[PDB]
Amino acid sequence: QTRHVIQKRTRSESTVESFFARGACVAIIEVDNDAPTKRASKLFSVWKITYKDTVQLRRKLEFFTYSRFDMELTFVVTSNYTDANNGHALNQVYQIMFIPPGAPIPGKWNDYTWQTSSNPSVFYTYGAPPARISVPYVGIANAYSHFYDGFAKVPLAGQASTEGDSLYGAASLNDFGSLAVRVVNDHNPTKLTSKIRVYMKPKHVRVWCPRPPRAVPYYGPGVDYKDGLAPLPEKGLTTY
Amino acid sequence: GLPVLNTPGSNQYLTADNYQSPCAIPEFDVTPPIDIPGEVRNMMELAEIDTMIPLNLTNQRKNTMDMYRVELNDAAHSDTPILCFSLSPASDPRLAHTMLGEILNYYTHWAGSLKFTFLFCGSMMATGKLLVSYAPPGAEAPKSRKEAMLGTHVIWDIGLQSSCTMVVPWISNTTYRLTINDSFTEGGYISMFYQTRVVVPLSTPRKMDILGFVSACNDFSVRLLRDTTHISQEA
Amino acid sequence: GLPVLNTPGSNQYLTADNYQSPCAIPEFDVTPPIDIPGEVRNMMELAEIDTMIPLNLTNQRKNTMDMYRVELNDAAHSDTPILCFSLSPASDPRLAHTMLGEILNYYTHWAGSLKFTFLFCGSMMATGKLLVSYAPPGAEAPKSRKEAMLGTHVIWDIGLQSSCTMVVPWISNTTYRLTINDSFTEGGYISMFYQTRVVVPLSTPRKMDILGFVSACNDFSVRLLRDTTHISQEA
Amino acid sequence: GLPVLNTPGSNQYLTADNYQSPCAIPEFDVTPPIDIPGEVRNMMELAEIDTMIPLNLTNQRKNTMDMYRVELNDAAHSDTPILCFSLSPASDPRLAHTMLGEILNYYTHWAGSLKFTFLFCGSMMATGKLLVSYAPPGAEAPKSRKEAMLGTHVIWDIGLQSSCTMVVPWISNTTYRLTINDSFTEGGYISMFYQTRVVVPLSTPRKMDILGFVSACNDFSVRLLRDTTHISQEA
Ligand SMILES: CCCCCCCCCCCCC/C=C/[C@H](O)[C@H](N)CO
């Protein structure tokens, strides 16, 4: 038997919007401001845009099969000296250029591509609050596909083994381009190292076809597993 | 310019903030949505789906399919429990990795009733009665059917219905329980006993399996989104 | 002053932003516009103009006028193709440097139908029928007329009309194709074959040229502005 | 952007400021309140509650229960005071640690009337009359009943009523007194004398105790919140 309870609890914080209403670190892009001839300093870094370099946001997203959302990107930039015996540096400015698929990838930190006449670029000044941009839903499909049970190519009879071979589960449905990051400043006498942490927040989220969450450690961009295949601990059947 | 005064919090990046920001791709002609089946609006929808409980986490069963099967047999009646577990849906190992447990492990607070369904997978010729009991906390966990029958309970006739659902109603001192093992917000005990016994005729399997499922009721809610301990990244 | 709190993104320079800024030349008496002919409102207008395809990119023809001419002759009928190219308007070398390809190479996504016109430049005394085929992707590219005729196609009587237009309708799994060579968004195949053969009387050139043109239809659109690979600056 | 000009005070953190700030836990389903008894809206409510005065802070009584008891006896009449203390509710040691004093020590300014109640705890057979006097400041503190009777005063018949309340009305040159020992805002003197004497019959205790209580009246108010000297933290 039960009594009458005027329930007041709501599910406001468990809406799909609220569940994803957080900035999650999806990448740590390392760049160096240094003399070009050092050959150990990366004067620019190219990171392919994805949520699969980290696990937390990946697991939350992969609770579902399909998603549709706008994205907010927040860039937190940290920098430090690498040695103390080569003087100091002036405040650095960073270029973060979005290179959509097909646009020329920079080959050098100061090549023509950084003119960014058509690529969106964010110039961030060190010490300023973390840079932020928004993008709408840009999928070429009607939703993003977290899982694609297929191939980009179908091998055909009479084709050699090398031909028609494509990775399982790899489709251009998630080809979103890259971010190219450089320090715009010319080098100081001392080497400086910077990290740009990219934080992703889905907004106006819609999701479809829920899935059981990842239970074993992720292994690659796919659903493959190799290690940690025993997540359940030991517990007696009649032990409270 | 307009006189302004920057308050504390200016220039911070709160990962939970909700501010406008410039669009990096203005005038983008977004692909319109289609009516995909199975849209989900709230994570609780997933928590309200019955998922199988790994009830049998013994050394030889854990991390195999056997962990989902609890063996009954046709032995003589006893008052000893068939299975026992605590009502800690986020932290009890049998419940933590259910879909409900997985969802709850992204939240700090939970409240509401739970549904525990049990499916009998023996032969059609098998008969029996079982007792499924929820004991609210604060007393010794039921060691035998004599204690368990004093709490909330249901008598399940496996001959009649292969499936039995027991609702564990929300009863708590606090308006929400924590999603960790916590004495103050402990949720009580769930146990199963033989009411009479499993009976089979000849030429019938004398050992069979039952399966447990747990879900959240429509009164269930969660609060205080948090990161889960169920996924980690090395290096 | 008015209490304000600077959010993330403050002090950044997004090259795609759209903000007001102070005028460096206030009260400038701007020269008014005149009604110049040929105003363009949308880049797609340029993409809808037929431009000549460099169909013949052989070693001896590429980067000459000959690359625009495809030679037909009056030889006996065969089922082998006259010309073949993939429906990748931005990345197929024959189509990439057409006006349509040039425009598409400033955008990541494209969708819509295409128009392929072919102009016969033989003598008035030449007669013939050709087959122009579009095969959607996923199968072996048409090796002969027998396969090509199974796809979308048009029969062109050069004796009747010196020009034939085939519309390649938008057919795609995705709502947009990428402007790069991509297997998942591959657009299919375009081929030309002799339907009967080119026939000429005596005292007539037995070899003539056809020209290809491509344009976008009125349903064509592009998205995600990007820098092109067709121009670079050294040093 | 909108032209703005940051004024002085920008980027400061004033601990007394009242600004908006982003919520770190958006869409949190707050537990609703219940009607708990004894809600307090204003600290003055606590100050209006009578609390016992440690009137007897002698070496042997201070920091014991004895400090709350003032001993009367049945000796012959005298004009010497039973007890004396200054009207400094926040800084006089007898009043500073009363609830009223504790509240006042979080504020710089105080104003309003006070209530001093005295409870006689002798036997029912004891009789007597006492004089309770408030002398506004500026003159010698009353050394005997002859001086004390010239100020505000009340005659208390312990035989009739075990409790007597004297209201010390707000009389001050300043509209507020400081919550420290201050000559300019000194509040005056409170004294108690025997009016006739305590009389007991035989077989009765000849020494008994009275208890003092102080509270704020409904006209009492405080200003200028400040930290108290009554709590400190070491290291
Ligand atoms: C100023 C240039 C830098 C800012 C522009 C960043 C460009 C972002 C465009 C790509 C959009 C990626 C959206 C998220 C990708 C995820 O894999 C899918 N949503 C998965 O569901």
Q: How far is CA D201 from the centre of its chain?
A: 35
Would you call A13 an interface residue with chain D, using a CB distance cutoff of 8 Å? yes
Q: Quick check: B198 and B122 in contact, CB under 8 A?
A: yes
Cα gap A87→A188, rounded to integer Å: 8
User: Are the beta carbons of D67 and D207 closer than 8 angstroms?
Assistant: no
Q: Which chains touch D (3 or more CB pairs under 8 A)?
A: A, B, C
> Of C7, C178, C21, C181, nearest to C94 (Cα)?
C181
Q: Which ligand 1 atom minimizes the distance to the CA of A122?
A: 1
Sign (positive or negative) of CA dihedral C19, C24, C27, C28: negative
Segment (H or E) for B34: none
Distances (CA, A) of A164 to A160, A161, A174, C134: 8, 7, 20, 21
Q: How far is D9 from chain A (nearest CA, A)?
A: 20
Nearest to A238 among B84, B230, B232 (CB): B84
SS3 B99: helix
Pairing state between β D51-52 and B207-216:
unpaired
d(CA A167, CA A148): 11
Spatial distance between the Cα atoms of D218 and D204, rounded to a whole number of angstroms: 40
Give the resolution in Å: 2.1
> Nearest chain B Cα to C17, which residue?
B22
Taking the CA of residue A144 as reference, the ligand 1 atom at the shortest distance is: 21
B49: closest CA of chain C, how far (Å)? 32
What is B186-229 written as a DSSP string? ---EEEEEESS--B--SSS-SEEEEEEEEEE-TT-EEEEE---S
Instruction: Give the DSSP H or E segment for C156.
Output: strand C152-157
In a mutational test of the pocket of ligand 1, which residue from A54, A64, A73, A184 has the highest number of ligand atoms less than 8 Å from its CB? Answer: A73
Q: Are D47 and D216 in contact (CB under 8 A)?
A: yes
Residue nearest ligand 1's atom 6 by CA: A98
Facing C1 at nearest CB: one of D7, D19, D22: D7
Helix ranges, chain A (H): 16-19, 56-62
The number of the ligand 1 atom at minimal distance from the alpha carbon of A51 is 17
Is residue B207 within 8 A of residue B70, CB to CB? The reply is: no
Token duo for residue B69: 């099967």
Contact C5 B7 (CB under 8 A): yes
CA atoms within 13 A on the CB side of B211: 12
Both tokens assigned to A144: 């993003």
Give the C-alpha separation, B29 to A58, whole Å: 27
CA distance B43 to chain C (A): 29
Residue A12 to residue D32, Cβ atoms within 8 A: no
The rounded radius of gyration (Å) of the Cα atoms in chain B is: 24
A49 Cα to the center of ligand 1, angstroms? 6
Whether residue A154 lies within 8 A of chain C, CB to CB, comes out as yes
- Interchain contact A15–D (C-beta under 8 A): yes
Beta carbons of B24 and C6 less than 8 Å apart = no
Experimental method: cryo-EM
